[PDB]
Enzyme design. Structure first.
Site, PDB file in Angstrom:
ATOM      1  N   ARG A   1       2.312   1.238   6.536  1.00 17.60           N
ATOM      2  CA  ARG A   1       1.551   2.021   5.565  1.00 17.60           C
ATOM      3  C   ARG A   1       1.028   3.339   6.143  1.00 17.60           C
ATOM      4  O   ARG A   1       0.639   3.423   7.321  1.00 17.60           O
ATOM      5  CB  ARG A   1       0.395   1.193   4.959  1.00 17.60           C
TER       6      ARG A   1
ATOM      7  N   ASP B   1      -4.474   2.529   5.645  1.00 18.22           N
ATOM      8  CA  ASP B   1      -5.092   1.248   5.297  1.00 18.22           C
ATOM      9  C   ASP B   1      -6.586   1.406   5.538  1.00 18.22           C
ATOM     10  O   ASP B   1      -6.994   1.840   6.608  1.00 18.22           O
ATOM     11  CB  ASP B   1      -4.529   0.143   6.190  1.00 18.22           C
TER      12      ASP B   1
ATOM     13  N   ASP C   1      -9.966  -0.872   5.258  1.00 15.55           N
ATOM     14  CA  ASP C   1     -10.453  -2.238   5.112  1.00 15.55           C
ATOM     15  C   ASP C   1     -11.965  -2.254   5.243  1.00 15.55           C
ATOM     16  O   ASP C   1     -12.523  -1.587   6.113  1.00 15.55           O
ATOM     17  CB  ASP C   1      -9.824  -3.134   6.186  1.00 15.55           C
TER      18      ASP C   1
ATOM     19  N   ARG D   1       0.037   6.011   0.000  1.00 15.64           N
ATOM     20  CA  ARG D   1       0.482   4.678   0.352  1.00 15.64           C
ATOM     21  C   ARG D   1       1.301   4.147  -0.806  1.00 15.64           C
ATOM     22  O   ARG D   1       0.768   3.858  -1.878  1.00 15.64           O
ATOM     23  CB  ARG D   1      -0.668   3.722   0.660  1.00 15.64           C
TER      24      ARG D   1
END
Ligand SMILES: Nc1ncnc2c1ncn2[C@@H]1O[C@H](COP(=O)(O)CP(=O)(O)OP(=O)(O)O)[C@@H](O)[C@H]1O
Ligand SMILES: COc1ccc(C(=O)CSc2nc3c(=O)[nH]c(N)nc3[nH]2)cc1
Ligand SMILES: [Mg+2]
Ligand SMILES: [Mg+2]
Length: 159
Positions: free
Chosen positions: A93, A96, A98, A84
């Site tokens: 991206r 990711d 999270d 990334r």
């Protein structure tokens, strides 16, 4: 002793499925993290900035002995491993990762909010989350995921 946490994974650049697969393997290799449940993958229209590629999104449950900040480090390191390069929050991206939920704990540090403060209005989170965590309580609303999830035609079964 391990705490149960949930991560949201996304990719909208390149070979998205292969990158998510690698991410899960890498996450499972950190000392202090075991991947313990995996949602189906969904193809999702990009939300926010719409002039970027369609995403693949999933959720995973992990069992972890890491603190929430160590977990965050591992999430960010995994993104680096998947190259990334873009850091524009609104932009595309390769990967990711999270943190969605960390047990029933809540925290709102300037750079870290858990439960993820945007999860409740994102079908690309809640649909795959509900697939694996329907009866888990979201601590901000105090509702179960199954009572938060909603229909969204922009979120499509992929795998
Ligand atoms: N629950 C969470 N999980 C991961 N990162 C979080 C977070 N809450 C805040 N952050 C912050 O967001 C930074 C990561 O930036 P990005 O991944 O580029 C934002 P994003 O994922 O595109 O938006 P989103 O978090 O609203 O989905 C981290 O460095 C961290 O400081
Ligand atoms: C101004 O209103 C918004 C701003 C930003 C957002 C974001 O979601 C953060 S960027 C982003 N991530 C993903 C994603 O993982 N999957 C999909 N499908 N779309 C995404 N978009 C939403 C609304
Ligand atoms: Mg992120
Ligand atoms: Mg995100």
């Amino acid at each position: 002793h391990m705490i149960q946490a949930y991560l949201g994974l996304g990719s909208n650049i390149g070979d998205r499925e292969s990158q998510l697969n690698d991410a899960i393997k890498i996450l499972n290799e950190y000392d202090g993290i075991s991947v313990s449940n995996i949602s189906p993958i969904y193809e999702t229209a990009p939300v926010g900035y719409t002039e970027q590629p369609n995403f693949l999104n999933l959720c995973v449950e992990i069992q972890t002995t890491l603190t929430v900040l160590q977990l965050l480090e591992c999430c960010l390191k995994t993104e680096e491993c998947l190259h990334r390069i873009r850091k524009e929050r609104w932009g595309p991206r390769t990967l990711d990762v999270d943190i969605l939920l960390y047990g029933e704990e809540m925290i709102d540090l300037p750079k870290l909010s858990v439960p993820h403060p945007r999860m409740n209005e994102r079908a690309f989170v809640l649909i795959p989350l509900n697939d694996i965590a329907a009866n888990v309580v979201e601590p901000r609303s105090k509702l179960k995921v199954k009572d938060l999830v909603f229909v969204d035609d922009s979120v499509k079964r992929y795998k």
